[PDB]
Design a binder for this molecule. Structure first.
Ligand SMILES: CCCCCCCCCCCCCCCCCC(=O)OC[C@H](CO[C@@H]1O[C@H](CO[C@H]2O[C@H](CO)[C@H](O)[C@H](O)[C@H]2O)[C@H](O)[C@H](O)[C@H]1O)OC(=O)CCCCCCCCCCCCCCCCC
Ligand SMILES: CCCCCCCCCCCCCCCCCC(=O)OC[C@H](CO[C@@H]1O[C@H](CO[C@H]2O[C@H](CO)[C@H](O)[C@H](O)[C@H]2O)[C@H](O)[C@H](O)[C@H]1O)OC(=O)CCCCCCCCCCCCCCCCC
Ligand code: CLA
Ligand code: CLA
Ligand code: CLA
Ligand code: CLA
Ligand code: CLA
Ligand code: CLA
Ligand SMILES: CC1=C(/C=C/C(C)=C/C=C/C(C)=C/C=C/C=C(C)/C=C/C=C(C)/C=C/C2=C(C)CCCC2(C)C)C(C)(C)CCC1
Ligand SMILES: CC1=C(/C=C/C(C)=C/C=C/C(C)=C/C=C/C=C(C)/C=C/C=C(C)/C=C/C2=C(C)CCCC2(C)C)C(C)(C)CCC1
Ligand SMILES: CCCCCCCS[C@@H]1O[C@H](CO)[C@@H](O)[C@H](O)[C@H]1O
Ligand SMILES: [Cl-]
Ligand SMILES: [Cl-]
Ligand SMILES: [Fe+2]
Lengths: 334, 80, 342, 137, 451, 34
């Protein structure tokens, strides 16, 4: 075997402690680049002029932040969707002022995470598994694409991409609500159903399997020693679990087929989070949540407020305050 | 099985639909009339489109007293 | 031995389509009334006298905007019983006063107790361990802290969540504007438990479905499972290798895996409840004092933390007059905080 | 409260003569205002020039006065600046500029009266909300 | 019934269409019937649009997506995009609807009456997925069909009335394209353009000469490519690189359509050339620029010196510099300085927006257009209430650009999921483990432990 | 052979009976005008 052939064999080897693979050849350098830049920036980057109004926002620990307030700040509104690599700046000082690290990080991260998804297909193939774990991971991936790429494209600026920080995340959410009424959008509502339901079904499945573990241990030892890695026999009694849950609700509301049960566990949160991702990706083009402002009117024509109008009052508060120095004209059109 | 007749058996039977081609529409029509006669408004105390405000009033009839709340609403309804 | 109690016990515990049990005596009426009360209120009942809002299909609201709204602030924490000193037996006035809110909240509370008792009862009869009941303590901690403890620490039931889609959305935004609830580490642990739970749900389901053994000829693989089979339907060894090589770590113990699935979202919800208990007393994670001292002294210092407070300040000023009508707030245009142009 | 004849009675002209609109005219007024005007004048404000609103008091202080049917109908034929000094048909929708504002092409004299009536009745219903902007939402 | 249950096909009802993989006659029926649905919609939807169409109202105020596609081709419209004749819209609708019956007939026939498989009936129409030469031959037929389609656009543009040109000197109008761009350095230069701001890859195409010449190239490339594929069979390197099966081919097409969907999203969002704003409404960038223009005009009329007006931040209130120095509109629209539109370009000089032209040369038609576009920005709720989320009810508006961008993002995204689903499955099926792991031949059990 | 009235019968009707009634009520509401 020649050099190339042996290299290919190593790359695709099923015996590496961490699988590399062809997607891995792209994933590894991009995730390392994104990680290293992120850490340095989160610790040490100077304030960034996110909104292009020469009002730099401090995101880093050394510049007066803590873990909760700290962020890698999105690139300047002056840049918009322009590609802003290091070599486009006159200097690192300029690059930093204008939020160059944000673009470097998100572009490397999105590529690496796309390759993380590809890698999951790839190893499944090498191991003779079925191939769809990567399809499950497409839900969170799509959501990352939504907030870091699609939304900025729709709005015309990476300054409106989600910040890489805890408080910056909340800022993104509040402004999003003000401008799109996301709470009143059915795709976000589906998303909530997906995550609330995913948590519910997680607790459900966890509790039901744990409830029906077959006695294999003494009182003084952890029941977990009752299962041995790679044993052929199932470790709990599904018929007993079904007998319980079918009686909790009714028989035909409970699963007795483990494969069907686990498919449901996969599909519920995944589909919900797909819709969440699509909410953000379509509000990116300003098709917003339901608007029932002044929908209920009396015989004379007096507006009779609903909870929708109270939501509206909250949204107006966010709207008028956000980016308080950025707007010169009466409408916030992007 | 737990003993009760299967739902599929029941809802495909002639005797079920003989009974329910009557009970279902009757209940639907009863509900319709609950609203159409205006009885729903009076049972629950829900204002009609013309009873939210007096003609020149532009102040909401909010309850402000705990134990004289019932009389307050009555007073508000007199003022209509 | 075989007296009326034992005879009643026999009947309650009959294997029927809908199991009843002793717990059913509490559960079924309270659950039915909570649900019935909600459907009744959202279909027919106004919030005009308590909130100045329309809130029913009858008034023109849709599924997203209907609600059974909380009583007026002047009601304090009145139980607001139908026969109580506020409504005095008058059903119409009771509805107009927000009596359906306490009706739903209280029947709901005793309903959840009955449901968790049902979880204990069925588990005992079927001979399984009661982990499902235990996990349900999380939904109970949430309902109790939010719908009961929170308003009880506040001025009245008025500030409890109203039972409606948009009304709940309003509750979220109120918590952002007034409590800065996103900054609270107990809410943050809640978020981690919910999103972590949803992650575990998705990843475990997908892993099982993609490490299945071929136990049939069908390309649709669901029929190749028997409830009574002794063998695992998927390969834990293959699943373990995949994840170890992809992520660096993997489960190796199936019992730990499934317990961890209980633990994560259950613990998260519990943490969020503790945060809300604090908010009952306005004991918020509202500020970082160091940030405020710096910002006050240095008008060039800005972080995402300071940006979010400005939004909160807007939420409060703009929503308060209509959201808190008992206060009779009149904020002249000139006092309203606004940035440039908007 | 009801949309009474009294609510629907508005000034026809600068002299003091009133006209009482029908409920049908009210509906038509709202429909036509939405059709031709709302994109800029939603809720009685003016999106492209917020300094000028459709409040009755503002209209009264316009030149010539626009707080009546005649003034408003005339505005819709030959719009002027607020001081009456310049004719703005070329940049404001009107019958005179129906060629460049095509939605005006099928507006009859009857339609103009309905729209005018809408503008005058709406604040009688909504009060300060009309011409108030987001503060009053 | 053959292969019409799970036990005989191996596929449950919910994957029922997988029963068709090796039944070419029924599968042809499926496809022809489906094409009938597409054509049905194009026809019926057009007629619906026309029935609801008010000619003096802008199309974009009327929830129209198809009539704008017809108008862009130069049918039914005159100067400024004004509708002069609705009959061409009627023709397109009717002919599609009529045609959908024919396809429906063929689809229904082949699906339930004709031969279930085509191989014994016809060597020409029958096919085996694993037959690589036959697969590339059918591909070749369709490439020729597509190349002819692209040339039909060229034909309309050059010999049959032209296309609507938003850039036409003197104002937007239908224009015959006499001099299409054939220079391969220009045409293929678009393909090498960065997709980022101020560049925009192929979405940047800003004149009809490039559009028409691009289709000449594509028409000829597709025909040549089609002939090539009829006459050849896949090379060795291609054979070793691809999976050869019906599901594999489906997956490649799914990936391709996903990519295309994403491109169409950005096209309708940014491009105002092949999606004229006269028909589709202003772009997001356009409406934002138009608001700045509106208040510059207004305030300058009031006496403001718009060049020297310092805004609150210290940047110009109306006018500032781009990061490379060009004069651009100020405020948040600073992000949209790459925008180019016929109402704005007259004010643009070599240095960007020209202050002399701004002071002296703004025409009422420009003012009108800016005001029209500022108030028809592509913002609106799901229930079609126009404007920002906080707007009160009144204006029934959501831009065709929003409808088209959102729908196609959703579609493109799910088609990427579909690609991963089928590509992954096709790999597993070809390798022989799509139904699960062999208990007695579990691959991991023959591998050394990782540690 | 099969019983007609059961606990299941009651549970079904406690939900079914008001549901249909309510749906008729909400159907009628769709024709109410201010
Ligand atoms: C766990 C899981 C188990 C499952 C859950 C089971 C559900 C069961 C349902 C139980 C419902 C209890 C209702 C409690 C009502 C209440 O409290 O109602 C409140 C009343 C007190 O009334 C309030 O009192 C206030 C203070 O008034 C006082 O001060 C005023 C101003 O100076 C005046 O002087 C006034 O005259 C004077 O009375 C205001 O007047 C309020 O308007 C009025 O509502 O207390 C009272 O009834 C009783 C007070 C003492 C008993 C408290 C025990 C239970 C509550 C625990 C929660 C603590 C909340 C702290 C927040 C953290
Ligand atoms: C095959 C495998 C590919 C793998 C290789 C990946 C590496 C390369 C790909 C880069 C990814 C795209 C990033 C750039 C996105 C963007 O800013 O794209 C926007 C551009 C358009 O750019 C705009 O183009 C405009 C062109 O309009 C100009 O010209 C017009 C002419 O009428 C008008 O006059 C207009 O006013 C004028 O400004 C301007 O130049 C703007 O400044 C400019 O921003 O679209 C385009 O180029 C078309 C590209 C569409 C792709 C959209 C991205 C979707 C991918 C996410 C999918 C989710 C994944 C889920 C995982 C699970
Ligand atoms: C187990 C089922 C159950 C439970 C736990 C509850 C519980 C509740 N109900 Mg609900 N209800 C039920 C079923 C139930 N209900 C049913 C089936 C109906 C249909 C009729 C209703 C209709 C209903 C209405 C209309 C209302 C309630 C209300 C209430 C609340 C106050 C009850 C109270 O104070 O009574 C006190 C009584 C007891 C605790 C029982 C006492 C029994 C003791 C042990 C024996 C002593 C009594 C003695 C024999 C009598 C002598 C008295 C003499 C001196 C005069 C509470 C949350 C109120 C509420 O929600 O307001 C917001 C309210 O208005 N219920
Ligand atoms: C050209 C496009 C295309 C084609 C020809 C196929 C064809 C096939 N696919 Mg693939 N698929 C596609 C796109 C496509 N798919 C996309 C975009 C996705 C991502 C969502 C998938 C995900 C997918 C999965 C998970 C599976 C398939 C499967 C299959 C096979 C069986 C399909 C079947 O019987 O469905 C029957 C159809 C239904 C059961 C109805 C689906 C209903 C959808 C979810 C709702 C659509 C929403 C609609 C717009 C709104 C409804 C309106 C309502 C109010 C009436 C067949 C080979 C199966 C397989 O792998 O076979 C080998 C299978 O398990 N596909
Ligand atoms: C675009 C939609 C579409 C199309 C074109 C097809 C196509 C087809 N399917 Mg799939 N399928 C679909 C969606 C579709 N499917 C969805 C959403 C599901 C989930 C519910 C399925 C589940 C499914 C299963 C489980 C099976 C099929 C099968 C088939 C094939 C034979 C059907 C048959 O035996 O008819 C029998 C039915 C009839 C004879 C009743 C009449 C049906 C006709 C075609 C209705 C046409 C009406 C039309 C208005 C008339 C216009 C005529 C006019 C032009 C003159 C056929 C090629 C079968 C197959 O693969 O065969 C091997 C099969 O087993 N399908
Ligand atoms: C490319 C797709 C597309 C786009 C961009 C539009 C756009 C538009 N249409 Mg047309 N139309 C379409 C396809 C499309 N339509 C289809 C398929 C039909 C047949 C039902 C129609 C028939 C039609 C009529 C009769 C009308 C319109 C109208 C309109 C306008 C208003 C739309 C509205 O209010 O939606 C409201 C929004 C919704 C109903 C939400 C859609 C939710 C879908 C179901 C989600 C799909 C998600 C995904 C695919 C599901 C997959 C699940 C996954 C897990 C596998 C707008 C310009 C109206 C108009 O103004 O005409 C002049 C109008 O009256 N359309
Ligand atoms: C791409 C779709 C397609 C394909 C590949 C086929 C292929 C086949 N068909 Mg089917 N069919 C179709 C669609 C299709 N048909 C449609 C749309 C209809 C309704 C008119 C029918 C109705 C039909 C019937 C009733 C029969 C067939 C039969 C046949 C077989 C022999 C046909 C032959 O020898 O023609 C030889 C060639 C000609 C006669 C000249 C073709 C003239 C065409 C129409 C000129 C235009 C070509 C142009 C590219 C079309 C553009 C349309 C586009 C815009 C959609 C063969 C398997 C027969 C069968 O299966 O035997 C048992 C049979 O009896 N077809
Ligand atoms: C639907 C359109 C279509 C399809 C499905 C095919 C399919 C095929 N062709 Mg054909 N071809 C077509 C159109 C098509 N062709 C046209 C229009 C022409 C005329 C120019 C040709 C001329 C042609 C030749 C000369 C050859 C093929 C070959 C092949 C085979 C393998 C090609 C391959 O591996 O590509 C994948 C591409 C690569 C492996 C090259 C490197 C990939 C880089 C990274 C792509 C860079 C683009 C990237 C995705 C992002 C940039 C964006 C981009 C839009 C600019 C395959 C059967 C080969 C064959 O075996 O002939 C019999 C071959 O030699 N084709
Ligand atoms: C309160 C009260 C009471 C009671 C009551 C009750 C109990 C009631 C009820 C009730 C009810 C019980 C009702 C009902 C209902 C209902 C309904 C109204 C419904 C509905 C529905 C719907 C509409 C549906 C829909 C849907 C869904 C959900 C899903 C998907 C799809 C669809 C769309 C289909 C009493 C007297 C004691 C006393 C005092 C008070
Ligand atoms: C296979 C299959 C399927 C499918 C099917 C299909 C998809 C189809 C189709 C179809 C079709 C696709 C069809 C069609 C049609 C059509 C028609 C029938 C037509 C027509 C028309 C007309 C008659 C017209 C007329 C008119 C005129 C002329 C003018 C104006 C007006 C009007 C409109 C009136 C399904 C799923 C069921 C399933 C199973 C199997
Ligand atoms: C419903 C409340 C449950 C309280 C249980 C007290 C049971 S009490 C018990 O009941 C026996 C028969 O059941 C009798 O034989 C006996 O005389 C009596 O003391
Ligand atoms: Cl902000
Ligand atoms: Cl601005
Ligand atoms: Fe499990």
């Amino acid at each position: 075997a020649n050099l190339w052939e042996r290299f290919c064999n190593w790359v695709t080897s099923t015996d590496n402690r961490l699988y590399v693979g062809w997607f891995g050849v792209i994933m590894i350098p991009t995730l390392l680049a994104a990680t290293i830049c992120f850490v340095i920036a989160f610790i040490a980057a100077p304030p960034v002029d996110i909104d292009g109004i020469r009002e730099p926002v401090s995101g880093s620990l050394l510049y007066g932040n803590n873990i909760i307030t700290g962020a890698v700040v999105p690139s300047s509104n002056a840049i918009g969707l322009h590609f802003y690599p290091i070599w486009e700046a006159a200097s690192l000082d300029e690059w930093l002022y204008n939020g160059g690290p944000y673009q470097l990080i998100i572009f490397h991260f999105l590529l690496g995470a796309s390759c993380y998804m590809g890698r999951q297909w790839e190893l499944s193939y090498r191991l003779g598994m079925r191939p769809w774990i990567c399809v499950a991971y497409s839900a969170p991936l799509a959501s990352a694409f939504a907030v870091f790429l699609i939304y900025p494209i729709g709005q015309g600026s990476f300054s409106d991409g989600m910040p890489l920080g805890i408080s910056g995340t909340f800022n993104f959410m509040i402004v999003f609500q003000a401008e799109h009424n996301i709470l009143m959008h059915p795709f976000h509502q589906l998303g909530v159903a997906g995550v609330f339901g995913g948590a519910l079904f997680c607790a459900m499945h966890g509790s039901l399997v744990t409830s029906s573990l077959i006695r294999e241990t003494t009182e003084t030892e952890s029941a977990n020693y009752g299962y041995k890695f790679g044993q052929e026999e199932e470790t709990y009694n599904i018929v007993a679990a079904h007998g319980y849950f079918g009686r909790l609700i009714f028989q035909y509301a409970s699963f007795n087929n483990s494969r069907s049960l686990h498919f449901f566990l996969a599909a519920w949160p995944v589909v919900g989070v797909w819709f969440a991702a699509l909410g953000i990706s379509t509000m990116a083009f300003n098709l917003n949540g339901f608007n029932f402002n002044h929908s209920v009117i009396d015989a004379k024509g007096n507006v009779i407020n609903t909870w929708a109008d109270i939501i509206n009052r909250a949204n107006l508060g966010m709207e008028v305050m956000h980016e308080r120095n950025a707007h010169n004209f009466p409408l916030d059109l992007a | 099985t737990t003993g009760e007749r299967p739902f599929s058996d029941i809802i495909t039977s002639v005797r079920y639909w003989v009974i329910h081609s009557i009970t279902i529409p009757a209940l639907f029509i009863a509900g319709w009339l609950f609203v159409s006669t205006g009885l729903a408004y009076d049972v629950f105390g829900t204002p009609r489109p013309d009873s939210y405000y007096a003609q020149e009033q532009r102040s909401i009839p909010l309850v402000t007293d705990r134990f004289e709340a019932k009389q307050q609403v009555e007073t508000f309804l007199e003022q209509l | 031995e075989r007296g009326w109690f034992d005879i009643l016990d026999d009947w309650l515990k009959r294997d029927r389509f809908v199991f009843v049990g002793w717990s059913g005596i509490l559960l079924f009426p309270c659950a039915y009334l909570a649900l019935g009360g909600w459907l009744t209120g959202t279909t027919f009942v106004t919030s005009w006298y308590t909130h100045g809002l329309a809130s029913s299909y009858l008034e023109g609201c849709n599924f997203l905007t209907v609600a059974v709204s909380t009583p007026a602030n002047s009601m304090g924490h009145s139980l607001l019983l139908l026969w109580g000193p506020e409504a005095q037996g008058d059903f119409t006035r009771w509805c107009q006063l927000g009596g359906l809110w306490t009706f739903i909240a209280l029947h709901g509370a005793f309903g959840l107790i009955g449901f968790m008792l049902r979880q204990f009862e069925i588990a005992r009869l079927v001979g399984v361990r009661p982990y499902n009941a235990i996990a349900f303590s999380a939904p109970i901690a949430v309902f109790v802290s939010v719908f009961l403890i929170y308003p009880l620490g506040q001025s009245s039931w008025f500030f409890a969540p109203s039972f409606g889609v948009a009304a709940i959305f309003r509750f979220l935004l109120f918590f952002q504007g007034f409590h800065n609830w996103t900054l609270n580490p107990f809410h943050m642990m809640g978020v981690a438990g919910v999103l972590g739970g949803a992650l575990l749900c998705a990843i475990h389901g997908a892993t099982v479905e993609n490490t299945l053994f071929q136990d049939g000829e069908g390309a649709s693989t669901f029929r190749a499972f028997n409830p009574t089979q002794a063998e695992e339907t998927y390969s834990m060894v293959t699943a373990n290798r995949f994840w170890s090589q992809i992520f660096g770590i993997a489960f190796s113990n199936k019992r730990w895996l499934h317990f961890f699935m209980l633990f994560v979202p259950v613990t998260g919800l519990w943490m969020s409840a503790i945060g809300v208990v604090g908010l009952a007393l306005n004991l918020r994670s509202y500020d970082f004092i160091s940030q405020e001292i710096r910002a006050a002294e240095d008008p060039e210092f800005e972080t995402f933390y300071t940006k979010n407070l400005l939004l909160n300040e807007g939420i409060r000023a703009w929503m308060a007059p209509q959201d808190q009508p008992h206060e009779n707030f009149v904020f002249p245009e000139e006092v309203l905080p606004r940035g440039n142009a908007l | 409260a009801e949309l009474t004849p009294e609510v629907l009675t508005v000034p026809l002209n600068s002299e003091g003569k009133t006209i009482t609109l029908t409920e049908k005219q009210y509906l038509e007024g709202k429909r036509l205002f939405q059709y031709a005007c709302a994109s800029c004048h939603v809720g009685g404000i003016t999106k492209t020039n917020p300094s000028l609103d459709l409040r009755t008091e503002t209209l009264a202080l316009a030149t010539p006065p626009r707080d009546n049917i005649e003034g408003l109908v005339d505005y819709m034929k030959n719009p002027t600046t607020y001081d009456g000094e310049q004719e703005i048909a070329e940049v404001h929708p009107s019958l005179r500029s129906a060629d460049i504002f095509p939605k005006m092409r099928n507006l009859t004299e009857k339609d103009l009266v309905a729209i005018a009536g809408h503008i005058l009745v709406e604040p009688k219903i909504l009060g300060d909300k009309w011409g108030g902007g987001k503060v009053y939402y | 019934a053959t292969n019409r249950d799970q036990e005989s096909s191996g596929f449950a009802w919910w994957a029922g269409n997988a029963r068709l993989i090796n039944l070419s006659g029924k599968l042809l029926g499926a496809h022809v019937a489906h094409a009938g649905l597409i054509v049905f919609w194009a026809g019926a939807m057009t007629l619906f649009e026309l029935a609801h169409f008010i000619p003096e109202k802008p199309m974009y105020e009327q929830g129209l997506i198809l009539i704008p596609h017809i108008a862009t081709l130069g049918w039914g419209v005159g100067p400024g995009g004004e509708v002069v004749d609705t009959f061409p819209f009627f023709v397109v609708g009717v002919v599609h609807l009529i045609s959908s019956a024919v396809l429906g007939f063929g689809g229904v026939y082949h699906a339930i009456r004709g031969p279930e498989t085509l191989e014994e009936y016809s060597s020409f129409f029958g096919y085996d997925w694993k037959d690589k030469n036959k697969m590339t031959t059918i591909l070749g037929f369709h490439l020729i069909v597509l190349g002819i389609g692209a040339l039909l656009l060229v034909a309309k543009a050059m010999f049959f009335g032209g296309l609507y040109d938003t850039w036409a000197p003197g104002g937007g109008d239908v224009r015959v394209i006499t001099n299409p761009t054939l220079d391969p350095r220009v045409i293929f230069g678009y393909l090498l353009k960065s997709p980022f701001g101020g560049e925009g890859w192929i979405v940047s195409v800003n004149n009809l000469e490039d559009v028409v010449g691009g289709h000449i190239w594509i028409g000829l490339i597709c025909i040549a490519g089609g002939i090539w594929h009829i006459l050849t069979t896949p090379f060795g390197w291609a054979r070793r690189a691809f999976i050869w099966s019906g599901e594999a081919y489906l997956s490649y097409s799914l990936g391709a359509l996903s990519m295309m969907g994403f491109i169409a999203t950005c096209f309708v969002w940014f491009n105002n050339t092949v999606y004229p704003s006269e028909f589709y409404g202003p772009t997001g960038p356009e409406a934002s620029q138009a608001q700045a223009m509106t208040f510059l005009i207004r305030d300058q009329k009031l006496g403001a010196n718009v060049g020297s007006a310092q805004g609150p931040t210290g940047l110009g209130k109306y006018l500032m510099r781009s990061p490379t120095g060009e004069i651009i509109f100020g405020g948040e629209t600073m992000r949209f300085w790459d925008f180019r539109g016929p109402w704005l370009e007259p004010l643009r000089g070599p240095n960007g927006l020209d202050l002399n032209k701004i002071k002296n040369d703004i025409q009422p038609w420009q003012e009108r257009r800016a005001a029209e576009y500022m108030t028809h920005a592509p913002l609106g709720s799901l229930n079609s209430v126009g404007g920002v989320a906080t707007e009160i009810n009144s204006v029934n508006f959501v831009s065709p650009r929003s409808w088209l961008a959102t729908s196609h993002f959703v579609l493109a995204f799910f088609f990427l999921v579909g690609h991963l689903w089928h590509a992954g499955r096709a790999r597993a099926a070809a390798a022989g483990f799509e139904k699960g792991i062999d208990r007695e031949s579990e691959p991991v059990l023959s591998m050394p432990s990782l540690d | 052979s099969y019983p007609i009235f059961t606990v299941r019968w009651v549970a079904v009707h406690t939900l079914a009976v008001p549901t249909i009634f309510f749906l008729g009520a909400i159907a009628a509401m769709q024709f109410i005008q201010r």
